[PDB]
């Protein structure tokens, strides 16, 4: 499984993440999940205390703990700020914050400690408060790298133009480089010049992108729910797995250095890094991703409000 640069970190990461996610929803299961992504060849686990109202976080420290790898052999992402109560992005919160992580995780760092859905909250504080803070906490050794993520990309450029160079190190985007909208490419050429990290997430714009269909809660507008819909649906008469198609497809601009997908069993593991690899011996199929990519014009890098 091929391993990417990470901006300037030095840190090399699995083009595949593993979302923890889903291990917020037994034990077993997540510790089998994670041997099985070690054995595949990933390196890079993302979470947060959001994620199960802080369970993914103890599931995730069970099974890497399980694991028996050494820990200078992977890379482990965390977040600050958002909660199942809310939003708060005050240094004494965060400075608080990765404490608690630490405890659930039972690790004594983390690489990657990152600013959760940063639109929530003031992006001046953001960047007067929140980003210092963190820069306190990497000098105590207990995170070593600082990120920032959310969904509009505007975000990425107002903090990064107005920090002091060098100040925040990886990127945590979402939804923007998939089939149906793949404007991430557009910040590349910034972050770059920057030398900031670059991961994505969603490869299935959170299952617009499956032959099932997005959840209920969805915040598409209908004129991309309706694309995606009949482009599954067009796969699905082919014998096409849309969802493997999406996936190969968000591993192929080798700029971003890890796609994380959410992943709570040994099959899911299995079925992510077989896509990555096949994409990489046999390449991809140019003739579906053609037809796929003409049925979703009409939803084409069509987005969604977030935040404030």
Request: hydrophobic residues 40%.
């Amino acid at each position: 499984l091929e391993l990417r640069p990470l901006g300037s970190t030095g840190l090399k990461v699995s083009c595949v993440g593993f979302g923890a996610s889903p291990l917020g929803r037994s034990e077993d299961e997540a510790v089998a999940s994670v041997r099985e992504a070690f054995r595949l060849g990933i390196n890079f686990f993302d979470t947060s205390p959001y994620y199960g109202g802080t369970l993914s976080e103890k599931m995730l420290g069970m099974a890497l703990k399980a694991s028996g790898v050494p820990r200078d052999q992977y890379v482990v992402s965390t977040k600050c700020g958002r909660y199942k109560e809310g939003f708060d992005f005050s240094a004494e919160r965060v400075t608080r914050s990765i404490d608690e992580s630490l405890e659930r995780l039972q690790l004594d760092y983390v690489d990657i400690l990152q600013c959760h859905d940063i639109e929530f909250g003031s992006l001046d504080q953001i960047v007067n408060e929140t980003i210092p803070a963190l820069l306190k906490l990497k000098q105590t050794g207990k995170i070593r790298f600082i990120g920032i993520t959310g969904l509009p990309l505007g975000i990425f450029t107002y903090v990064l133009d107005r920090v002091p160079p060098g100040s925040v190190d990886v990127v945590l985007s979402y939804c923007h480089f998939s089939i149906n909208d793949n404007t991430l490419e557009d910040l590349l050429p910034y972050l770059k010049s920057k030398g900031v990290g670059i991961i994505s997430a969603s490869p299935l714009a959170m299952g617009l992108l499956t032959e099932g269909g997005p959840p209920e809660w969805h915040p598409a507008p209908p004129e991309l729910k309706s694309a995606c819909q009949d482009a599954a649906a067009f796969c699905q008469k082919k014998g096409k797995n849309i969802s493997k198609l999406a996936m190969q497809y968000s591993l192929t601009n080798k700029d971003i250095s890890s796609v994380l997908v959410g992943m709570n069993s040994v099959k899911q593991v299995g079925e992510n890094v077989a896509a990555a690899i096949e994409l990489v011996s046999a390449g991809m199929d140019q003739e579906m991703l053609s037809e796929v990519e003409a049925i979703l014009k009409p939803g084409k890098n069509l987005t969604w409000p977030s935040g404030i």
